């Protein structure tokens, strides 16, 4: 279900459904465009992690909590100079609230089944 996140995240990057960042998370959750809400963790965030929790636990918005910020940043495809090898250095993104119009996907239902229970 991590390679499911990879596909849904890239079918929202490519087709530009996601309202990426916490300011644009606040946009997508005030307009209520959130079909999902991805979250990275283990960063010195006393108020920031409660912000996304109380926003997501307001009405209907789901929650994926991955561990590392840099890891979500390396998935969300920001900084890769010399693609032949490894990404050089990528900023740690937290809240990439996907409004996935591209449901032409295998990975929509398997994440929706991981949220069904």
């Amino acid at each position: 279900v991590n390679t499911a996140l990879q596909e849904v995240l890239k079918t929202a990057l490519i087709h530009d459904g996601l309202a990426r960042g916490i300011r644009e998370a606040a946009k997508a959750l005030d307009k209520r465009q959130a079909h999902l809400c991805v979250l990275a963790s283990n960063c010195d965030e006393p108020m920031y992690v409660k912000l996304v929790e109380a926003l997501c636990a307001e009405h209907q918005i789901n929650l994926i909590k991955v561990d590392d910020n840099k890891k979500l940043g390396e998935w969300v495809g920001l900084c890769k100079i010399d693609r032949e090898g490894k990404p050089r250095k990528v900023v740690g993104c937290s809240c990439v609230v996907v409004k996935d119009y591209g449901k032409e996907s295998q990975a929509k239902d398997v994440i929706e089944e991981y949220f069904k229970c």
């Binding site: 300011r23 005030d30 307009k31 920031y48 636990a57 307001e58």
Partner: protein, 68 residues
């Protein structure tokens, strides 16, 4: 060549880290304590908050103004 009158200082951006943290106030329960007024415009709906000025209120997107 050499001019007398000194040059104009350029505008530097006053970058404010976590500006969303000021816009809202997160509650103990799954709800909100939104300090800022939302812009009651057509161009911008519930997303854009207004400015908390010290003698007025101003929207930053659609340039709407409300005074005391």
């Amino acid at each position: 060549k050499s001019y007398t009158t000194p040059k104009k200082n350029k505008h530097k951006r006053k970058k404010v880290k976590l500006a969303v943290l000021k816009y809202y106030k997160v509650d103990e329960n799954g709800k909100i304590s939104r300090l800022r007024r939302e812009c009651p415009s057509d161009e911008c709906g519930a997303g854009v908050f207004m400015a908390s000025h010290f003698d007025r209120h101003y929207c930053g997107k659609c340039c709407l103004t409300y005074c005391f």
